[PDB]
Symmetry: C4
Subunit: 52 residues, 4 copies
């Protein structure tokens, strides 16, 4: 494409990679922490039920 | 010509779509995990209360 | 050309900030709600035995 | 090296800084709230188990 069109594509591409990377990191963190909370709750409930 | 202005507007438009799409995905994920935890907590507490 | 770059950066910063604030508010509100639900349920359990 | 490439690099760099800052802030908030939830759940479960 033209010089200006190619440059626009470059800017959008580069920032999309940055945005996607940060997005994936936050997604993974939220999933990890929520998954751990469910794991803890599951184990604790089992312990409570076994104790009374 | 007006191509620089139009290209700037296009860059902002394209990246707005990306930014908003990732935002919506995170918003939905956080809401889903929160709802899941609330349900798990309420269900488990009901079980506990009925067991003793 | 410098003014165009500034305009692009400003406009996208405004949008990024808007979505950031919304996520911050969501996380805070949902976390606060979960803490309340956990404590309320625990209070019921303790008062039950 | 050119003004066109320097401009693109400028836009990408400046917005990357903004994106990174917001990302770190959200990361820290998620970590803080998840840590609090684990503490509250642990505290409460220990209280329940010590009470019966
Ligand atoms: C800003 O976006 N935060 C508030 C999101 C809305 N609430 C947390 C009130 C709704 C929900 O998820 O149940």
């Amino acid at each position: 494409g033209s010089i200006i069109n190619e440059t626009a594509d470059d800017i959008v591409y580069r920032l999309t990679v940055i945005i996607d990377d940060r997005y994936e990191s936050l997604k993974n963190l939220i999933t990890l922490r929520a998954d751990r909370l469910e794991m803890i709750i599951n184990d604790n409930v089992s312990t409570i039920l076994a104790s009374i």
